Amino acid sequence: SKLKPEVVEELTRKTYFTEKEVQQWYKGFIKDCPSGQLDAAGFQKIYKQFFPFGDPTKFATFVFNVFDENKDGRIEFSEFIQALSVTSRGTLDEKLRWAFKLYDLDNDGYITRNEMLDIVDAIYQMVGNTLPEEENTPEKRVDRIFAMMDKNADGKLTLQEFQEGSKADPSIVQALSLYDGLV
Ligand SMILES: [Ca+2]
Ligand SMILES: [Ca+2]
Ligand SMILES: [Ca+2]
Ligand code: NA
């Protein structure tokens, strides 16, 4: 199955991929999702493929919701390739804007402790028996992040607090500096 020329052209101009790369990703996408419409269950499936033994089910749902840009309940190829482009090849600022969207569950422009607790709980569930005290619970992790990033101590992180606090921490910068998962 191949992408219509005018479609690959558009997706090439909107992502950090070449035309060949867009075509290769379309083929992988379809081999796995012949309908071209990825549902949350088949998304959760794929994360298990990458992260067996743990329980990525909740984290996969949160990630699915960011991929599902128009909030229609399915991931189509245009959403898939754009989310891949930013998460794997975006600049630091673009990656941090995308991560903010992940944590901001209700899309109101802030990340609250509870929202972040929900995501970090979900991450801890995914990894699990795959840590130091001071960071052995999602609660301790969220406390550390808010200590570092919540500059006006109001229990919320704005985009700018999240971006600057992330750029201050070398481990985070290291995680966001990957290109295709390689630095
Ligand atoms: Ca969608
Ligand atoms: Ca929010
Ligand atoms: Ca704040
Ligand atoms: Na291009």
Considering the chains and any ligands shown, give keywords for the structure.
monomer; 183 residues; mainly alpha; Recoverin, domain 1; 2 domains; two-stranded antiparallel ribbon; binds calcium ion; binds sodium ion; calcium sensitive guanylate cyclase activator activity; calcium ion binding
What's the CATH superfamily of the largest domain, by name?
Answer: EF-hand
As a percent range, the share of strand residues is under 5%
Percent in helix = 55-70%
> How many structural domains can be distinguished in the coordinates?
2
Distance between the termini: 33 Å
> Could you tell me which ligands this complex binds, including any ions or cofactors?
calcium ion, sodium ion
Global structural class: mainly alpha
**What strand order characterises the main sheet?**
1-2
What's the alpha carbon Rg, rounded to whole Å? 17 Å
In the CATH scheme, the class of the largest domain would be Mainly Alpha
Spell out the helices and strands N to C.
Answer: HHEHHEHHEHHEHH
C-alpha geometry: globular
| The CATH architecture of the largest domain | Orthogonal Bundle
The count of DSSP E runs of length 2 or more, i.e. the number of strands, is 4
CATH topology of the largest domain, by name, is: Recoverin, domain 1
Helices, by number, come to 10
For the biggest sheet, the summary is: 2 strands, antiparallel
Binding site for Ca(2+) 1: 68, 70, 72, 74, 76, 79
Membrane topology: Peripheral membrane protein; Lipid-anchor
InterPro entries: EF-hand-dom_pair (IPR011992), EF_Hand_1_Ca_BS (IPR018247), EF_hand_dom (IPR002048), Recoverin (IPR028846)
Protein name: Neuronal calcium sensor 1
